[PDB]
Structure formats: C-alpha cells, structure tokens
C-alpha cells in the first residue's frame, strides 16, 4: 500500500489527473531534459 498510494498521490498531486502520456508530461514543467528523456525529444527541447 505504501508504493500503491505513493503512485496514486504522485498521479493526483498536481491538482488534476495525470495520465502517463507525453500529452501530460510535456504540460508539467518538470525539466526540459526530463522531457527530452521522454519519448519525444526534439520537440520538447526545441520548445524549451
């Protein structure tokens, strides 16, 4: 339950739902090279 509740609260901690997609993780400003290390690289670096 520690890990499960930690996953769910890290999902919901931004005041709204966070589906594990580029379509969310690009919207959170959690590091341009985190975004680059995600599946899209050139667009997120190029926007940063």
Partner 1 sequence: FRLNLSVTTPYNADFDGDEMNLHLPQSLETRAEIQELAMVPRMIVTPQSNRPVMGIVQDTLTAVRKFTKRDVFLERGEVMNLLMFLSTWDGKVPQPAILKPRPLWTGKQIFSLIIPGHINCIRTHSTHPDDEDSGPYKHISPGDTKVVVENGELIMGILCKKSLGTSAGSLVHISYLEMGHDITRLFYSNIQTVINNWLLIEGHTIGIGDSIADSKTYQDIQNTIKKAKQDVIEVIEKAHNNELEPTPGNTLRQTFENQVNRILNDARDKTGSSAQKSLSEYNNFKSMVVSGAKGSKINISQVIAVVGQQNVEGKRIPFGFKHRTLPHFIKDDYGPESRGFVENSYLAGLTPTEFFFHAMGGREGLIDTAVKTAETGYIQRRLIKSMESVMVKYDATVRNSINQVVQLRYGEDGLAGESVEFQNLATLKPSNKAFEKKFRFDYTNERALRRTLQEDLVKDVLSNAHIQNELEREFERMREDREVLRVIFPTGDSKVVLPCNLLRMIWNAQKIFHINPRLPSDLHPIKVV
Q: Provide the minimum distance between the beta carbon of 30 and partner 1 in the complex, in angstroms, as a whole number.
A: 6
SS (H, E, C) 17-48: CCCCCHHHHCCCCCCHHHHHHCCCCHHHHHHC
Residues 6+ apart with CB under 8 A from 32: 44, 45, 48
The correct pick among 27, 31, 41, 47 for binding partner 1 (CB under 8 A) is: 31
Nearer to partner 1, 20 or 42 (CB): 20
* Chain positions contacting partner 1, by CB under 8 A: 1-3, 5-7, 9-10, 13, 20, 25, 29-31, 34, 37-39
């Amino acid at each position: 339950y520690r890990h499960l509740a930690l996953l769910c609260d890290t999902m919901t901690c931004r005041g709204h739902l966070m589906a594990i997609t580029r379509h969310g993780v690009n919207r959170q400003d959690t590091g341009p090279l985190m975004k680059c290390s995600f599946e899209e690289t050139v667009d997120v670096l190029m926007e940063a």
